[PDB]
Amino acid sequence: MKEKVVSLAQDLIRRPSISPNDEGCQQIIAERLEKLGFQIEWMPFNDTLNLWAKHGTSEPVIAFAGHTDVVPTGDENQWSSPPFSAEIIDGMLYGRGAADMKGSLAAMIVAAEEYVKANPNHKGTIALLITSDEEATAKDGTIHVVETLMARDEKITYCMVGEPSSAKNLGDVVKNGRRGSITGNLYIQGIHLAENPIHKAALFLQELTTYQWDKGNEFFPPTSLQIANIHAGTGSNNVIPAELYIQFNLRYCTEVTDEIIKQKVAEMLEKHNLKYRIEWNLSGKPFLTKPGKLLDSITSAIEETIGITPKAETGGGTSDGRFIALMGAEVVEFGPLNSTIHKVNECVSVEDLGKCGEIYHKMLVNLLD
Amino acid sequence: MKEKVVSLAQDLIRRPSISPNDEGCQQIIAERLEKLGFQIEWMPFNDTLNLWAKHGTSEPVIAFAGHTDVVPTGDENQWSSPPFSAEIIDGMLYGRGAADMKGSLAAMIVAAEEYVKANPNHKGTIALLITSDEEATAKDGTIHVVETLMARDEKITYCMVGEPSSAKNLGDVVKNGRRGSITGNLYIQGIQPHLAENPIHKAALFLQELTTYQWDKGNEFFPPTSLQIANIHAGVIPAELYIQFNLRYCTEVTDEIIKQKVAEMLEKHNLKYRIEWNLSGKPFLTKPGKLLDSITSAIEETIGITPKAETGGGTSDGRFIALMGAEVVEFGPLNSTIHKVNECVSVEDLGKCGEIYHKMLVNLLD
Ligand SMILES: [Zn+2]
Numbered sequence: 001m002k003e004k005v006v007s008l009a010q011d012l013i014r015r016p017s018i019s020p021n022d023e024g025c026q027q028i029i030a031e032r033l034e035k036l037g038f039q040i041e042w043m044p045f046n047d048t049l050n051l052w053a054k055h056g057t058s059e060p061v062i063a064f065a066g067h068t069d070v071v072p073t074g075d076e077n078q079w080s081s082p083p084f085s086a087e088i089i090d091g092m093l094y095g096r097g098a099a100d101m102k103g104s105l106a107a108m109i110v111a112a113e114e115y116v117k118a119n120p121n122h123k124g125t126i127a128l129l130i131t132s133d134e135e136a137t138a139k140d141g142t143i144h145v146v147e148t149l150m151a152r153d154e155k156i157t158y159c160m161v162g163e164p165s166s167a168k169n170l171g172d173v174v175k176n177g178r179r180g181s182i183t184g185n186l187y188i189q190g191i192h193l194a195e196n197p198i199h200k201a202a203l204f205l206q207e208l209t210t211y212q213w214d215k216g217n218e219f220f221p222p223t224s225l226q227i228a229n230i231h232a233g234t235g236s237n238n239v240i241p242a243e244l245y246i247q248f249n250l251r252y253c254t255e256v257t258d259e260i261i262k263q264k265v266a267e268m269l270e271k272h273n274l275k276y277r278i279e280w281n282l283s284g285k286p287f288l289t290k291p292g293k294l295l296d297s298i299t300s301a302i303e304e305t306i307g308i309t310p311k312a313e314t315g316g317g318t319s320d321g322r323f324i325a326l327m328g329a330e331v332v333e334f335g336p337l338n339s340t341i342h343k344v345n346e347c348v349s350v351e352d353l354g355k356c357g358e359i360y361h362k363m364l365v366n367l368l369d
Numbered sequence: 370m371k372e373k374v375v376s377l378a379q380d381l382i383r384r385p386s387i388s389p390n391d392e393g394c395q396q397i398i399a400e401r402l403e404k405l406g407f408q409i410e411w412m413p414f415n416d417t418l419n420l421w422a423k424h425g426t427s428e429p430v431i432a433f434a435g436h437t438d439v440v441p442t443g444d445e446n447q448w449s450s451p452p453f454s455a456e457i458i459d460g461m462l463y464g465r466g467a468a469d470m471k472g473s474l475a476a477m478i479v480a481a482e483e484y485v486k487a488n489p490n491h492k493g494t495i496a497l498l499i500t501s502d503e504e505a506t507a508k509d510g511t512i513h514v515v516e517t518l519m520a521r522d523e524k525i526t527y528c529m530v531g532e533p534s535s536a537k538n539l540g541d542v543v544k545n546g547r548r549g550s551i552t553g554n555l556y557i558q559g560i561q562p563h564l565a566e567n568p569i570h571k572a573a574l575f576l577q578e579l580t581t582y583q584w585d586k587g588n589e590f591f592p593p594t595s596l597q598i599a600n601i602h603a604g605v606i607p608a609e610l611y612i613q614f615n616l617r618y619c620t621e622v623t624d625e626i627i628k629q630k631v632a633e634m635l636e637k638h639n640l641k642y643r644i645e646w647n648l649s650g651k652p653f654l655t656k657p658g659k660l661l662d663s664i665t666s667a668i669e670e671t672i673g674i675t676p677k678a679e680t681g682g683g684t685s686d687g688r689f690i691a692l693m694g695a696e697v698v699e700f701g702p703l704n705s706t707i708h709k710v711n712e713c714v715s716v717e718d719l720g721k722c723g724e725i726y727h728k729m730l731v732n733l734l735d
């Protein structure tokens with residue numbers, strides 16, 4: 001599997017897919033999958049390309065998720081190997097996206113291809129969910145795919161996000177949780193003395209910024225809140241404003257839900273007698289994948305392939321996992337060393353990419369058979 | 370009086386002096402006053418023209434103040450007589466600024482002139498302070514004149530502001546006080562488990578207090594000091610919270626008390642901040658005495674009624690002129706039709722205003 005993985009990784013690295021421009025990465029991938037009888041669906045939105053490709057006719061649905069976009073290179077003259085050459089030196093594959101995450105994307109694709117080729121009538125559904133914008137504004141990427149699937153009640157049961165998870169040695173870390181994000185765009189209307197609506201708003205703001213959402217848990221720090229924006233008045237003096245806008249964001253853990261958060265904020269506003277409107281913008285749900293089928297399939301795949309037991313951690317780097325978690329899928333993340341991601345001279349071990357393909361493949365085996 | 374006043378009114382109304390555009394109004398006025406021996410001093414600033422005309426040298430310095438600027442007319446369609454014609458229909462003079470306040474400005478100028486003519490060696494100083502921007506920003510208008518004056522230690526003893534004060538009948542109301550005005554521009558700095566010491570939280574406590582604190586509950590002559598928030602804006606950056614607020618304050622507090630109390634509230638929450646205060650006016654209250662008598666008696670003499678002295682209602686540069694420490698009163702025509710289509714004023718009332726302002730001068734100086 002090494003050479004297949006490496007060859008696909010180089011192919012992708014050679015395509016300079018700075019977000020959100022895919023530069024034909026997904027076209028190469030769809031061409032190899034379609035050839036093997038995967039059903040291909042394109043889900044573009046604005047300037048972002050998204051691919052949803054699947055093989056199978058039943059549950060469980062196992063999605064491999066990743067992105068073809070890469071961050072900018074910076075000064076290409078400060079690279080020892082040109083960033084889109086995909087040079088291999090001393091078993092190290094150099095290039096922007098080598099680690100984050102074209103090498104592990106290639107490994108997930110090759111693993112999926114080999115499993116399907118070997119088992120044309122396999123149980124469940126093996127899917128790839130590939131976006132061209134994880135790294136930038138990312139409003140039109142995985143979130144678009146997930147809203148499309150949800151709109152038509154299509155399910156994903158399990159998801160492996162192939163973001164580079166490993167800290168010091170291949171296999172040493174699997175990510176098994178991420179925080180959610182929700183933004184409140186609050187508009188307080190209508191703005192004797194204690195009845196002033198700016199006073200009632202300030203009463204609200206004081207309760208909001210000292211309310212204890214949770215203490216967190218063993219796996220997450222406590223839910224945090226940011227007041228991102230306060231705006232009343234158009235800039236004219238001696239004119240009382242009609243509206244007071246407050247934008248706040250929570251990065252939240254599994255101790256609370258979007259519904260608890262919405263309800264607490266509604267209660268607080270009612271308690272302080274405020275009239276208002278609010279537009280809520282949910283940017284993903286937290287997840288925490290506990291011991292079970294999904295965590296065990298990837299843990300055992302790593303143990304049996306390279307003889308290391310991963311530690312399960314939450315957070316660190318970024319991923320689209322919280323978007324996928326919006327659908328109720330159970331999510332984990334695994335892939336190669338992340339120390340060089342987003343830096344000059346990004347690289348990845350070619351041997352590790354071969355082992356990653358074996359690992360992804362064995363996870364499919366463990367999760368279906 | 371009447372003809373003289375209504376002829377000058379008409380002249381002024383026919384210039385469409387939307388603020389800060391004087392449209393030659395003050396040139397007219399300066400011309401006339403020049404002829405009778407008034408020293409003319411122009412004090413333009415930016416796009417605003419201001420006139421400072423004095424006759425005489427010594428105290429008491431008595432100033433008639435008002436403005437040549439006028440608010441916009443709307444579609445000249447809806448006006449039964451053209452806005453800047455100044456036609457007299459059925460004893461009513463129609464025109465934008467007929468009531469606010471070219472009519473009474475005309476009256477004040479005529480009285481000043483007639484008094485100087487008749488008393489060329491009079492004691493004291495008769496002045497006129499006129500701006501082409503009272504109705505808009507007005508940081509370029511009367512305050513600039515006053516600033517200039519204070520700077521040279523020039524003073525005004527008494528001031529009559531010709532804003533239209535009468536409610537139902539000419540002469541029924543004189544304004545003898547206004548509240549002061551001060552704006553604070555506040556920037557709270559460093560706003561970005563142990564949640565209560567977060568700056569945003571502390572800033573919220575401060576905002577709670579600022580928006581409900583009771584500065585005073587007025588007194589016999591004023592309503593209470595009010596605070597209004599004008600702007601609140603915030604949103605790794607030099608993250609500050611900007612709060613702009615205004616106080617309209619009575620004699621129960623001063624600018625220094627306001628400043629000192631806001632500072633205490635901030636310091637109580639250990640807030641890092643900077644603040645710039647802009648004091649535009651002080652309150653004034655002219656109690657019974659020489660000034661208030663002179664205008665009270667002037668109205669009684671001319672009309673046979675006695676005005677009620679009131680504080681507030683409409684607007685004026687009075688609070689701005691109170692900064693000099695001048696005693697200030699305001700009197701003028703019926704206000705009901707100001708800032709509206711078909712603005713007009715009684716030509717009979719205009720003539721009477723002239724007599725009124727003229728008697729007030731006589732009363733004050735003799
Ligand atoms: Zn990535």
Ligand SMILES: [Zn+2]
Nearest residue numbers: 469470503532
């Ligand atoms: Zn006026």
